[PDB]
Amino acid sequence: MTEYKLVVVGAGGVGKSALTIQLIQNHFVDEYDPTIEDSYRKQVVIDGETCLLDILDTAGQEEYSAMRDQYMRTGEGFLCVFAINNTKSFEDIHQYLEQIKRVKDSDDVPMVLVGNKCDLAARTVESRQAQDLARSYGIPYIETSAKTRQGVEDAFYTLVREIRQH
Ligand SMILES: Nc1nc2c(ncn2[C@@H]2O[C@H](COP(=O)(O)OP(=O)(O)NP(=O)(O)O)[C@@H](O)[C@H]2O)c(=O)[nH]1
Numbered sequence: 001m002t003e004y005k006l007v008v009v010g011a012g013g014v015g016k017s018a019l020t021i022q023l024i025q026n027h028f029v030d031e032y033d034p035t036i037e038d039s040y041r042k043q044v045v046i047d048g049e050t051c052l053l054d055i056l057d058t059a060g061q062e063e064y065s066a067m068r069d070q071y072m073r074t075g076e077g078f079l080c081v082f083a084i085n086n087t088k089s090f091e092d093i094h095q096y097l098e099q100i101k102r103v104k105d106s107d108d109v110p111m112v113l114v115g116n117k118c119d120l121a122a123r124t125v126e127s128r129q130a131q132d133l134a135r136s137y138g139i140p141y142i143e144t145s146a147k148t149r150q151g152v153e154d155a156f157y158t159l160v161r162e163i164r165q166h
């Protein structure tokens with residue numbers, strides 16, 4: 001069956017793992033557990049077709065700039081995550097978008113910009129700011145909360161649809 005090679009990228013602590021674990025395992029990882037590199041494979045049905053999600057959950061670590069080019073080369077779609085209560089994570093996601101485009105030699109890579117932790121009150125990134133960034137890359141912006149599950153399936157399934165209809 002069709003496989004979708006999804007890669008979840010972004011700064012440390014934005015919720016890359018919590019989002020993936022919510023999607024695959026249906027619960028919220030409410031603990032400190034930094035990632036090295038984890039892979040999740042799951043058969044799902046999206047819009048009436050069986051497919052395999054192969055999800056690579058990456059490290060936010062800025063020192064892993066070597067494994068980073070490699071997964072960017074092989075990935076098909078990227079969920080580019082920042083946290084809406086962490087302005088520095090929003091500025092960091094710019095560098096991920098640019099690196100993907102450099103490594104893939106393409107301005108047309110399936111991507112979704114994800115503003116995570118939308119359940120938290122202390123928002124410092126306004127939605128319009130993130131919409132403008134997404135629009136400059138021609139990609140959707142979707143807000144999520146790995147805690148409440150708001151937007152989680154929307155974000156991942158939108159990324160699949162961006163690939164599928166590419
Ligand atoms: N309130 C709230 N907390 C969240 C959300 N997503 C993640 N968190 C919390 O934020 C922290 C970091 O989450 P985690 O998924 O490990 O982040 P990560 O991006 O995978 N970090 P790393 O790059 O080190 O692997 C954890 O305490 C987690 O419970 C969310 O949507 N809402």
Ligand SMILES: [Mg+2]
Nearest residue numbers: 016017034035
């Ligand atoms: Mg992680």
